[PDB]
Amino acid sequence: CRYLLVRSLQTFSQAWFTCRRCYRGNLVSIHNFNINYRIQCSVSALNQGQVWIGGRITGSGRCRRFQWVDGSRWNFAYWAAHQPWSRGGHCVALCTRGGHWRRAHCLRRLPFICSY
Ligand SMILES: [Cl-]
């Protein structure tokens, strides 16, 4: 699908509505390996190590679950080695190296990927 990288560091919360407000979309929802490869190349030029996506791990206590912010189905995931359980915060982050997803604390200010 269509996607756009934003380079301005913003916390996950800041980043989500930047897509809705500035570009009229949501954080990117990845559904196959091709699209996740297209994004890997787009963030290779970033000195940053991670970028935000629509992945937000929710759950109360021991009920941690994964949902896209745009509401799309969770039919694919490319988690890194030593990810995701037993670490991280409540927001998913794509590692700029290789394209592996990694959990991160939402308050981290990283670039992000909007889809439209
Ligand atoms: Cl968090």
Swiss-Prot record:
Span of domain C-type lectin: 1-116
Q: Which domain of life is it from?
A: Eukaryota
Localization per record: Cytoplasmic vesicle, Secretory vesicle
SS bonds (residue pairs)? C19-C114, C91-C106
Q: Where are the transmembrane segments?
A: none
User: What is the protein name given in its UniProt record?
Assistant: Eosinophil granule major basic protein
Which gene is transcribed and translated to give this protein?
PRG2
Residues of the whole record sequence present: 107 to 222 of 222
